[PDB]
Amino acid sequence: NLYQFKNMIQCTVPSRSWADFADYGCYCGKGGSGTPVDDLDRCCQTHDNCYNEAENISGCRPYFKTYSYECTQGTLTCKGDNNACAASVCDCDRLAAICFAGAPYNDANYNIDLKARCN
Ligand SMILES: COc1ccc(C(=O)O)cc1
Numbered sequence: 001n002l003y004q005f006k007n008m009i010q011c012t013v014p015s016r017s018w019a020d021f022a023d024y025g026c027y028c029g030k031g032g033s034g035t036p037v038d039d040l041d042r043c044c045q046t047h048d049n050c051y052n053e054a055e056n057i058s059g060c061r062p063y064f065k066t067y068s069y070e071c072t073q074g075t076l077t078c079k080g081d082n083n084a085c086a087a088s089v090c091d092c093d094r095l096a097a098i099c100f101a102g103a104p105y106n107d108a109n110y111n112i113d114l115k116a117r118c119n
Pocket residue numbers: 002005006009018021022027028029030031044048
């Protein structure tokens with residue numbers, strides 16, 4: 001669920017406030033359309049598409065599904081107890097949190113005008 005994703009982010013990018021990723025580029029946050037503006041926004045585009053794919057699983061609600069995971073000693077793990085929905089959603093979130101850690105953060109690309117820039 002979103003709260004768990006935030007915690008993944010807080011654990012893999014402890015240098016930034018997590019809210020730095022909640023409104024970035026065309027794809028990080030409420031947004032989901034347009035050309036991704038940079039490598040970090042590409043991470044979010046793949047995460048958004050991963051959620052749309054997980055939605056196809058019956059009863060699977062990526063913002064709300066509580067999965068089982070651990071963040072310890074620099075590593076994220078999706079646990080074995082997870083059903084198919086939980087395992088997909090946890091995987092979407094783990095891979096995005098890892099991608100976030102590896103991508104440049106461009107202040108300019110924070111809180112961009114989606115209507116105008118993401119058609
Ligand atoms: C916790 O930060 C985020 C990041 C991306 C999204 C999303 O693109 O759905 C939601 C919350």
